[model samples]
Target: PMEEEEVETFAFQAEIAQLMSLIINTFYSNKEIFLRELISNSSDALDKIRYETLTDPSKLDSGKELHINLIPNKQDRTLTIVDTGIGMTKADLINNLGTIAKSGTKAFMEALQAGADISMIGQFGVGFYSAYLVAEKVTVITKHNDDEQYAWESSAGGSFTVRTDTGEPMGRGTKVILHLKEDQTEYLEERRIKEIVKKHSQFIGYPITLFVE
Candidate 1:
């Protein structure tokens, strides 16, 4: 029931594609870092949502606890990171995953072109792409306070799919599922993952739990 102009698809600038490829291919070494990056991202989401809720507590109707769940399934060879934070909508998936880095791919490129220091940009939200290093397929299930549940899946190859997350468990947060590569099966081990989490993210403010299968 929306007008055509109400929906617009904007293409990412060419430079963003180049930046994405570079970061995805050569950014991080160990895949375990992906878990830390994800948890950090969730913490940011929670901060933002809590800020919003301070103005309107009705926003958090789900009554779910604020926490993060790291689930590594050896059978499916998948690692899923979930958080109860401000989730994403379909548009968010497109803007966050499909296109260039959401925070500032264009500006960062400009800084590089102008001979400005670009190191700081790497510390921004661009780290999400690192998931591609270990995941053959990545699926994100998110529920926002203002929108219906949505799922986004991609192979970190400049293309992705977004659709309604039908009958997904009701909640307000995001879940990232990484289908681990054959060589990365060590991540499926509960002890290894827990060790990494404790070393890097033990100080995180939220409760972090691991659900194994």
Candidate 2:
């Protein structure tokens, strides 16, 4: 019942904004690691569904080819990574891809409100936010088994937009697109991306294929 492109914006939490600023400022030298982090996430997604299949085979259904596809558009200066893995629901998209960074953040805040923290790390994953190292913009199009298709997008810090999609299902997977900055054109180079993958993603336990444009 909602119109396409109807986006809701949200502000970054105080801690998220602080951490993101520190990462961007202190970690620009190793910006190529962005690909490594992204690939790592993709691998985790694949492993998650694979593990789920062990308990309930319906998780994967008929899709057995668990792989990651990297499409580097040179003309567009964009890098796209697609995976046939466990994707995200709308709530997952909002929590994971949104400025919140992790679902635990909400619970973390609740605990802090009740003055119950100061114990141990409960489960805070801020890995996906590392993509902002060399990316000017980021988009995630994902479809999960328990939810409908959706699109989640953002431009580093501050705010993001999520919306329902009318496109074909992605067969329980996620596609992440990185809009590279002008100075970070090396990411659009196959050799550069491959070298990064070869160095950091060799043992990721998934087939990583580069689709040339």
Candidate 3:
């Protein structure tokens, strides 16, 4: 437990960085869709934890009911999304968030352009990068069932940084804080955020809560 907090940075893979560039600059110009992508991923994470409980019931946060919480603050200009689901280890963060070893993102985009099936879900996990569409700074704080909590931050430009979350330890799960862009202040609107979630995430397997605090 003596490991000190230090920020470690990882440059994004060239192809991955380029792909995300297109996502923000071209494809995901409808920035509100970022919530859908995040909510979808959170649902997947929730599914993972549910499946785990069927076998090994010893996971740290096992018995808790799965839920997603959305918190928006106009003052701080931050929108936080949290899930009481299976979180990630540092390696998982690097592979999934920083960059995975193998990805079909290139092909997926090609197929999308070729007028092939563009509805492919989770192919190469590129959907998460949609966060950059709205936030200049994306911060992820996660606690995996098997690993301690850690923090990850990135401008989502070309590099990302990770470190121990040395703050109050989250019992289990993930917290994603989006430092919303100045022009995106409307995201802090209670009614608008709720409408977005209800429109896109109502079907999620977990109960999604819009916490005012």
Candidate 4:
């Protein structure tokens, strides 16, 4: 077995459970919205680096191209989306992904619970939870320019774990692997994923490719 690495587990931030249930159930009616959200998030990451490099040329020292790749593994029933963009540090993973909506969470939950039209939550940046709509497990491996690569895993069972990545190294980016649900195998089809991208992210600034092995 590989040597053990330090892993820290954290409970979902306050209101995360309720917030995710709302997202997984009511907020988004179309399951494919997850792909749209993921693509949008990746685009934002790419934009971040593009703008940052203007001020800090050294941020692009890795010389990695800015693009997104979607890999669908039929045999493994998984869909992985990777982007060469502004990757996150450990604190970013915790605060950005672990937390539901940051300081706006409680108010968001209140609105959701009151049956208010909370579609705005998508704009509020909680769309990541939509991953739970079609995934049983999600693993993220990311590397920020100023920090080491790290891996985060969660089943949305109220907690998540993070540890130093022991796999392939990323110069600067984030890679998200979704363990697609057995019934959600449709997402594992390259054609279907491409269609979704064509429909939802056709105009995104970054180039997105469906990588086939």
lDDT of 2 by residue, 1-213 (tens): 565465677777666665455545643445566677778788889999899889898877746678999999987889998998888888788766655545555554454345542221123455566677777788899988888788887775676778786665677788898898898888788788788888867888888888876
Candidate 1's residue-wise lDDT over 16-51, tens digit each? Answer: 556656555653445567677878889988877877
How many angstroms is residue 27 displaced in model 2 relative to the true structure, after the best TM-score fit? Answer: 6.2
Model 1 TM-score, 2 decimals? 0.79
Better TM-score candidate (1, 3): 3
Better of 3 and 4 by lDDT: 4
Best by TM-score: 4
Clashing pairs in model 2, backbone N/Cα/C closer than 3 A: none
In terms of lDDT, model 2 sits at 0.74
Candidate 4, residue 166: CA error in Å?
Answer: 1.8
- What are the clash counts of all predictions, listed in order? 0, 0, 0, 0
The 10-residue segment with the lowest total lDDT in model 1: 3-12
lDDT of the candidates, in the order given = 0.73, 0.74, 0.78, 0.82
Candidate rank order under TM-score? 4, 3, 2, 1
Residue-by-residue lDDT tens digits, candidate 4, 72-133: 99878899999989989998998888854466666777766776554456666577777888
Q: Report residue 186 deviation for candidate 4 (angstroms).
A: 0.7
How much is 92 displaced in model 2, in angstroms? Answer: 1.3
Tell me, what's the RMSD of every candidate?
A: 5.2, 6.3, 3.0, 2.5
Residue 1 of model 3: what lDDT? 83
Per lDDT, the best of the predicted structures is: 4
